[PDB]
Design a protein around this ligand. Sequence first.
Ligand SMILES: NS(=O)(=O)c1ccc(-c2ncc(CCl)[se]2)cc1
Ligand SMILES: [Zn+2]
Length: 257
Amino acid sequence: HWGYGKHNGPEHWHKDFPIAKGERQSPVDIDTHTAKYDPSLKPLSVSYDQATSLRILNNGHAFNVEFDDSQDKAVLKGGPLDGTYRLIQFHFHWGSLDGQGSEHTVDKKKYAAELHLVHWNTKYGDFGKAVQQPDGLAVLGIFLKVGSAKPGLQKVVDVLDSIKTKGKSADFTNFDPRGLLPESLDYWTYPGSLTTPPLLECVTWIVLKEPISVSSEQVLKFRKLNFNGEGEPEELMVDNWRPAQPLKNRQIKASFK
Ligand SMILES: NS(=O)(=O)c1ccc(-c2ncc(CCl)[se]2)cc1
Ligand SMILES: [Zn+2]
């Protein structure tokens, strides 16, 4: 029953999930002038050569591209992280209009969309145990702006017709998430949360500075998805983003000068 409408959207979530008003909630605004360069941050390691995508699912809130995480095949390491974090899924948040859609903001600027590559810390054995720990997850966040098409996204865009409604899934093998990465791995990092219920405070956020460009046609196809199930009243899957939350007692660190 939580969602993104007038009666069940982000300002209501605290009633079922009181941690919504917690001390390390996400997303946040990234104030680029107050983030401090941290020369001790190690370089980020994104090792996606052996990634094994399996399936694409409309879960009623976003679409997830799911990966085989039963072995160390697509891993994130380095940066602010200790140990090895395994890719489980990616998804996006987007707007009804190009002027909004991202969850994180940069000096209050909203991008058209935001990609989340979700990874779990292998020392906790599985995703469900990992989300109960303060260092359980690492989410790589990448902003999308509208301009030139992203060739590596098109395979995703073109399957969306087959998962229009909530609960639909489709086979989605051999998708290479390297084709969704900008050139630079310069990032900001801070401790935060899942940005949807249950809003668990288990995430090391790593948000890349360089956006990727996608075409207006690509993002228009995201906006034809539905929040509803098949044979229910059509409600377009748009504006599935949580707004910026208070920073509280946290510092955002930059990997670059
Ligand atoms: N937007 S986000 O990257 O912070 C993010 C990632 C993962 C989840 C969940 N995965 C399984 C869940 C219980 Cl079915 Se909730 C929720 C939110
Ligand atoms: Zn997300």
